[PDB]
Amino acid sequence: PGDQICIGYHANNSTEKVDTILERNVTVTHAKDILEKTHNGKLCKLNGIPPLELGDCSIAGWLLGNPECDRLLSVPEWSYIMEKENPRDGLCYPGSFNDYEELKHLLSSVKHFEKVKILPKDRWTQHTTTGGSRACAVSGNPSFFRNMVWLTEKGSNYPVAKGSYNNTSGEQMLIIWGVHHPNDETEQRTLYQNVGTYVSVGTSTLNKRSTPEIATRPKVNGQGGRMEFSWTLLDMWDTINFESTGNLIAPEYGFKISKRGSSGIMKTEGTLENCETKCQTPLGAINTTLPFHNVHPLTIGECPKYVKSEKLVLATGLRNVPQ
């Protein structure tokens, strides 16, 4: 028996498993898990910028100024918007919001508004502007959406109601208006005096008219009547014109888009915590260098890529073979 040299390979105490094509459950000396599976369970600031927490409010409740949503009358720049699945505080006076989903979609590219008083209430000198509803009651008294004006009869008169705003703000401006559809003729006459009325909205590109609809409907929040809201994004230097012989719910404000960018609405029942993140999901925040994650498909920020997988492990070392 003489001197020897032997060729061989590394083995260790590793129990790391990988799958291959020909064989599953293979032990290897070294392996790299490329799937992030954990999150912090918290809603966080995204790059130091807090989300807008709607609380019990809907997007509509916020923008109309539902009195239950007063904390949201002036809000700072946000990184994302948190909304509940079924917020309680939306249209307190019942009705509908035309193209509501399209409005929500617009919000995913908007990070801040400046609310601008475009049609001061005091300027409606020929109409009453104090009208509210027990549906929007505040401290046991009739009130109304903060951003809106309910024009009604004054001195048993409702003359043609005309208002105009030129968007000189420097940015596109979200404006909302509504039409009141009463329950009955007594409601029509006592509020507006006129019968067979209309609401007319016109810009350079929009031409929209409504005739109000008097009909018996099931009471929602105590009201058989309905308010149908619409919106537009008024271009810079374009003018919006309102015109009505009755039933107009006028905006007092416009929301100038003051900041643009990648954003979004996250559906969650949770609340903002004092934590910071670069990637947020509805289940919690992710902090990883890994390329993939399986936490939730709907994420905001600088995120890994989402896959359905339970496991993604790359072999780096060799087959780990018993001594």
Ligand X SMILES: *[C@@H]1O[C@H](CO)[C@@H](O[C@@H]2O[C@H](CO)[C@@H](O)[C@H](O)[C@H]2NC(C)=O)[C@H](O)[C@H]1NC(C)=O
Q: Given the rule CB under 6 A, which residues bind ligand X?
A: 166, 168, 218, 237, 239
Site for other proteins contains 102 (CB under 8 A): yes
Site string for ligand NAG, 18-47 (x = CB under 6 A): -------x-x--------------------
Q: Identify what 76 binds: a copy of itself, ligand X, other proteins, none; CB under 5 to 8 Å per kind.
A: none
Binding pattern for the stretch 93-122 against a copy of itself, x by CB under 8 A and - elsewhere: -xxx--------------------------
Per the structure block, which two tokens stand in for 179? 């039409």
Binders of ligand NAG among 244-303, rule CB under 6 A? none
60: contact with other proteins by CB under 8 A: no
Q: Partners of 260 in the beta sheet?
A: 110
Report the Cα–Cα distance between both ends of the chain, in Å, rounded: 24
299 Cβ contact list (under 8 Å, min separation 6): 279, 280, 281, 286, 306
AA letter at 179: V
Contact 307, 35 (CB under 8 A): yes
H/E element holding 53? strand 52-53
Residue 322 touches other proteins, criterion: CB under 8 A:
yes
Distances in Å between the alpha carbon of 207 and those of 162, 169, 201, 203, 228? 15, 22, 6, 7, 16
Name the binder of 168 from ligand X, a copy of itself, ligand NAG, none, CB < 5-8 A by kind. Answer: ligand X
182: contact with a copy of itself by CB under 8 A: no
Residues 314 and 312: their CA atoms lie apart, in Å, by: 7
3 binds, among ligand NAG, a copy of itself, other proteins, none (CB under 5 to 8 A by kind): other proteins
Provide, rounded to whole angstroms, the least separation between the CB of residue 252 and ligand X.
Answer: 20
Could you give the 3-state DSSP secondary structure of residue 89?
A: strand
Query: Dihedral angle at the C-alpha atoms of 270, 273, 277, 281, nearest 10 degrees?
Result: -10
Estimate to the nearest angstrom the gap between the alpha carbon of 42 and the chain centroid: 20
| Region near a copy of itself per CB under 8 A, out of 123-131, 139-147, 233-241, 257-265 | 233-241
Beta bridge partners of 154: 157
Please tell me the distance from the alpha carbon of residue 229 to that of residue 177, in angstroms, as a whole number: 6
- Is 236 a binding residue for other proteins by CB under 8 A? The answer is no
Residue closer to a copy of itself, measured from CB, 32 or 209 = 209
Would you give the binding string for other proteins spanning residues 238-277, x where CB under 8 A is met? --------------------------xxxx----------
Residue 283 burial (C-beta neighbours within 10 Å; 0-12, 13-18, 19+)? middle
Q: Please select the residue that binds a copy of itself; options are 10, 88, 209, 259, rule is CB under 8 A.
A: 209
Site for a copy of itself, rule CB under 8 A: 94-96, 162, 181, 200, 202-205, 207, 209, 213, 215-218, 220, 226, 228, 238-239, 241, 243
Site for other proteins, rule CB under 8 A: 1-12, 18-24, 26, 28-29, 32, 34, 99-102, 104-106, 108, 233, 264-267, 291-292, 297-299, 303, 305-309, 312-323
